[PDB]
RNA sequence: UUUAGAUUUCAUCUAAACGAACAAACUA
RNA sequence: UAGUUUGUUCGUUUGAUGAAAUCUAAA
């Protein structure tokens, strides 16, 4: 089976997600909110933050994938346009990551199976943990596959260590969060390039993942630079920041932002609330009064960033560096002066 | 069975009202409107003019009664608070006639059967045209019953000649619209008084229903007054009106309003758009510029009104008159001078 | 008193407009609508079509002026900014004519009396029918005054015969709809120019107001021109219209449109629904299939238009003619060829 | 170009439709309504009756086609999924007839030109009146083309004599409303079948288009049957209607409905307000009390319907008839007895 | 009296709630929000989160009860349908706790006094700290009464120590928050069953209320089990939790969630956001990746839960155990092998 | 018509075991 | 081809809940 509003709310009340049970409950739809009648009074079940209708969004939210799914930025960078027989929820913007669906909700479905002729020119996302999806990927034209194990005849591309589980990004211990990504374009199995993966952390809950990051969050600016021989790579401005002018200087890695927030809190106005490899913020340091309207921030592994920046040439006045990060190319604006770097920030 | 939004919408799309079939259709709920996707584009099915939530009101409208039911004013004067296993629609305000239901909608249900203890202090409306409802009325504590035929052991009260059929009031020819009303209060079958019934007409679609009304619409004022010996009863101002001052005079029967409308169109602003025995309108005569803010109109049969007014006494300066109209008492303000009438407007 | 939502709704329920009575009724504000509970069910009182809040517009509409008031276009052309101690409802757009009030509603009041200093750089509209406003007008700095009679020391200007009474524009018989307009700017009593007045009619209820208009709606085009010696003034195209090409020609008077609508109905799309001396319509003729996007239509009296067009000189190729209509200058684009007129349409 | 809400509203205010000029006006968006500030007060320009956002719907409504375009149902039957560089407005449901656009609005555009790769698996509607579109139709894969004249190398199909102009269905006299339809499928020029075209009339504005229709609207039932020898085809119930029982019988042509409406008005509750070759109405006769929930009505030409029905065989108990009407197959359920007919309702 | 949106907003602006003062202010209603104009600009007074009209919900919210009142779960469990001459606000869902009112709001009133015949088949909640409300309880047919002290001729039932003061549950010191509950059904006084009371705590502000809870938050799992002789009662799973497999095991007491949260924060999704004895959560362990779609959590005192689980019979394969908590029966599902408990989890919701 | 009890069938249950099937990881 | 771990599905163990149906008893 029954595709209806009240069965979905039944499953939400009784199981927390649309599991497929049978039964119905009272439902009220007022404004963009879905209420239900429990003990004679109306309890809100879902408030619609999306641009879909209320019941469409409520049904999509209830049928969201509760397994560990890849982060939305990885799926966007791989070019995924639609997901086969599942809804992938974007908790950053409280909406589905993809506009249409395949065999999920009648209002959004462009097909009931990924093998129809309308899904052919679209990179479908196939979940190899679900039985029967690997063969669909094999017969598909454009698609992306993730698998915990190995698939015969296909060279795996090992993905990021972390994945989103119910909106929480974690490196799984009780569950596998590291999948092998296979991408097929026009019936030709492409090999994904060797990439770096961003760590997906945040300022408040920042935990270092390497001894170098521990040294960064622990040692002083001079001690850390001297210890790792980072002289002449402008780490004082690239990572630590410059809180002395009216405009904030540098600070284009999340680890430096976390260190500053530990020293003195500030304000990050994420004026585009979406998940991506490179984020822009509106920072305003509350102590010095130094603010910058746009600050491009990418949360690489500090060891990986060191490896990248030490593999460059400080010979030209400026150079744009192409690096594959999260299965996509990121262009870095390098401005290296004679023997030093004036600035090096993502664009 | 299934009670859900999409089954209701399937029934509405396929049959125009909820019949009880099985099936579902895609449905969008935006603002107070229910849309369905037909041929790939969204077609509006219902716009909520009520104060209920959209899906509640949509279900109630889908499950409205399609058989000829008594007019809402008759039920209100009979004190009906709720209906048994049916929904009665007030087409004047595009909202259900009663606040709660019995065994129709999960959200508005106070009970599933009219014999539950919660329904005992409520005058339920039983429809004798449906089987088993007469036995429910006998087993009810407080209830009102209508019957096309006769019920054993109960004294009928002959109701009005017309009934409402999908918002169209008519005197049914192919179908019966004259019902016998039975009322029971605290388990005691009470006999309703002898009453006069309002004809429930309008100005634009006005048709006379007696010889006297035909004379009124055709003969002049003096000819009509002389022919029916209506001298000494202020029929010039009470019925025809006075379009000579800045404030309109009299005009308290729908027949004279219709005569004027045939003479000259004007404006009737019904500031309380609901069905009742006595209606107040904001008249603005577009020809003479005479407007009256509040003007009570009661659409009686002219013969019955003549009988009532000739059953009066022209002795006192003023008197309040009690007339049972539509199973309820109507208070008439009669300002009559010595042997003549100054004015006569319902209160 | 008491200024409250429930008292306003009490007056609307009991009298149709805010009369100043004392009392309160239950009210519910859902969407942009105000509902009141009568006989246990909610009856809608006011649906908000304006851009004000619901209670604000409900209070303004209840306190609207129900006497014969000047039409909105006359007050606009006179530069009226606000009305003193009254609310003038613009029924064309179902919203107040003026953005603020003086001593009406706390949410819009810029003052409680028109004598305050904030009202000084504003043309306030004073109603001479309300006692005391003429003295206020004399003491005012900028203002407009209407008087049924005469005001000592001020030369009256005769306004149009018709006036708006509850949204119905009428020439009063039992009420006076003709006023004397006075204007004062910077404390200086200005004299209004001699003007022609548009009759403010419509196609559907079009009634001629002179013998010349009677002949127009009766005689043929060639007979009418010959009888009134309208040869050489392009009355075939200016007035009657040219339903022959894909683009409609001329038809810049309401009387010709009314003649055609009597001959054959069409569609007038008023894409700027507001009261103005010159109206632009989107004509689409349903018989000939000729549609014009913008067709400026001015509802002059036919005799006055003839008096206008016979005061012209048919010598220049093109001319912009200034005619003061409704207290404002209206620019006519006149194209006249050798001895004739090519076109003559309002700008 | 400039693509902005203010430029669109400037074009709408100055010209009534988006012509392509330059300028901006103040704009407000409250609820689903767009207002503009004319003379200091807000004037509503557009009320969104669609499911799209307000500004998207406003931009589409402004950019609608104001030339005579084919009726919507023809485009649906031909399988049109999108229109190239134009917007076709479905005035029955006050929304665009196609969900996406090409080169119109950035919010709905799936492509900027109809030649992109995403447009290939879609039947694009090309108008030959716009220069350069025939070359596009030749190189398109799936498409439909209309032309006033003829195209070299393509065999035309003569279209219906009526085309919709600004929501007015008319037979063009000053302009051409008859196009030649060319349809291509998968790069292959398909030939459209010979079809009978519905007239698209209405009850109130019903005008006969043949002498037979004149006789139907003038002669009585028996006289019309006798004159045209329509015995043995059950024209008494098929067209004239059966207002004798509680349920309406037959009445599946618009001509009989119009005749009855002339005799006595009734209700047409169009529960699905959209344009199609066959329409269903919820009829409730106000005079006799006869109401039918579903009544499938097709407005064929009476001569064409006579030609079709006299080509049938009255020898079977039941039969399904495939009649190509408006470029689509219509199934007719003919329950005819031995020389008589039980019922004949289109499906 | 005056009953109007402008007088109500005047009281809100001047005094915070509805005190019954006289006066008015300019009020604007846009969306589900009530705005008031202070110094030429509009200020948001109240955003409507309910299913009621904005002005109705604003009038109810203004006239809410500011004294310590019982938590809404206690009133639901005792069966209260309506409140006499007061509004009980549900801060867990920002809406009135009861559908209709008695003598409060003309739009929601079913009666102006609880003695009318429409209030007879409803358990009207009667306060005792408002004079004359006890005698209304005695004349009532169905109702619930609370009292700080004693009522002559009635047997008190001592209720929970905590009460909700303006949405803050607290064991009062300056103001008394322990009431005596009296229930009356069909005109007959009913003795309430002896119950345990959930402590109404939360994860972030968790404070132990007994020595056993201090030991639980301080000691290790094995040390605690050995000290309190809880071997064989599945305390490793029922209370502590089992973050080893893909689906979370156990963790049915709020104190265990508190210990885990202090060790390592996780996510609770309240997919039915209301107030009840047993809460269902969508727990996702942010550390191990362990999750559970429905995880029934009850906030009993640890000593009381130990007392409950030590009085079960560990013989049957399974048994549904009915425990009276907050004046209602809570069904605990008991699975136990021979001499050891497999699991014991609440089920409600 | 209302209520209580008994019986048949279906779905569910925040634990485990068993058997089956599929897939991945370790191994022979 | 076989043993162990993990994930998905089906059925059994144990008590109960809700629904559809049947019968009995009481008012």
Numbering used by the authors:
A (entry chain C), B (entry chain E), C (entry chain D), D (entry chain F): -1 to 345
E (entry chain A): -1 to 347
The authors write:
Coronaviruses evade detection by the host immune system with the help of the endoribonuclease Nsp15, which regulates levels of viral double stranded RNA by cleaving 3′ of uridine (U). In coronaviruses, Nsp15 is a homohexamer with features that are well-conserved across viral species and variants. Each of Nsp15’s six protomers contain a C-terminal uridine-specific endonuclease (endoU) domain, with the rest of the protomer controlling oligomerization and supporting RNA binding. Additionally, prior structural data of Nsp15-bound dsRNA shows that Nsp15 utilizes a base flipping mechanism to cleave dsRNA8.
However, these structures are potentially limited by the presence of multiple equivalent U targets in the dsRNA substrate, which introduces heterogeneity in the dsRNA density outside of the flipped U. This heterogeneity can be difficult to resolve via data processing alone, potentially resulting in the averaging of local structural features around multiple Us into a single position in the map. By utilizing a dsRNA substrate containing one highly preferred unpaired U (same as in Fig. 2) and a catalytically inactive Nsp15 mutant (H235A), we were able to circumvent these challenges and build a sequence-defined model of Nsp15-bound dsRNA via cryo-EM. Our final map has a resolution of 3.24 Å, with many regions reaching a local resolution of 3.0 Å. Nsp15 makes close contact with the dsRNA via a number of amino acid residues in the endoU domain of protomer P1, with a few supporting contacts in protomers P2 and P4, in agreement with previous structures that show dsRNA engages with a particular groove formed by three protomers of Nsp158,44. In the active site of protomer P1, K290 (one of three catalytic residues) and S294 (responsible for discriminating U from other nucleotides) are within H-bonding distance of the flipped U. H250 (another catalytic residue) is poised next to the 2′-OH of the flipped U. In our structure, the third catalytic residue H235 has been mutated to an alanine to prevent cleavage from proceeding. Y343 uses its aromatic ring to stabilize the flipped U while using its hydroxyl group to form a weak H-bond with the 2′OH of the residue 5′ of the U (C13). W333 is intercalated into the dsRNA helix, stacking with the base 3′ of the flipped U (A15) and the closest complimentary base (U-21), which is in agreement with previously published structures. Hydrophobic residues are clustered around the edge of the endoU domain, forming a plug that shields the hydrophobic core of the dsRNA around the flipped base from solvent. Our sequence-defined atomic model shows that most interactions between Nsp15 and the dsRNA are mediated by the phosphate backbone and are not base-specific.
